[PDB]
Amino acid sequence: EESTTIDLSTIADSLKETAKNLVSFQPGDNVEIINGELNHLTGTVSSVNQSTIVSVRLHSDDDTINSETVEIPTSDLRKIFNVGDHVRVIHGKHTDDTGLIVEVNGDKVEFISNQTKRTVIVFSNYLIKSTDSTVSINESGRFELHDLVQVNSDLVGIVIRAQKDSFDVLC
């Protein structure tokens, strides 16, 4: 059709649907409110009931407000990602990558990875605050841990650490 996705309406709708369905919440998560009378307020998730009602304790300069729990629908909550927090990718090409947040450019979040140890830019909808990686490398590659792998014609080594799409080899 001589064009690069000239049509992007249905694609945008698919993006909206995937973004809405992919969000999952946990207790203690810092969230922000988009609509309603409580718009532009920060709070911490206290408890989760079913998948549409989330009790959130709001944070504000007034002490009497900070001791109240409010149940808020999940459709009006956006996750808050602070710089320097361990986060694990939910879904995408960089799935199961963990690291520390470096730059928060609103919708897009940049973080230094733990496995590849390089900066990766992934949308904020694909991040969950997981303080530890605990990544299992089973059912991947062609190499178990501590395998004696032939690197090339005259090079050999032993796999020291294993990753989703890379390996560490000791010659």
Binding site: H146, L148, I158, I160, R161, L170, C171
Partner: peptide, 27 residues
């Protein structure tokens, strides 16, 4: 002639260090 050994105290490479068999004695 190289032996790949696993050790408890060498945490630098998870215990894996390479030595030749001529350098070691069996216990």
């Amino acid at each position: 002639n190289f032996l790949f050994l696993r050790s408890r105290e060498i945490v630098e490479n998870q215990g894996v260090f390479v030595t030749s068999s001529n350098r070691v004695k069996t216990i």
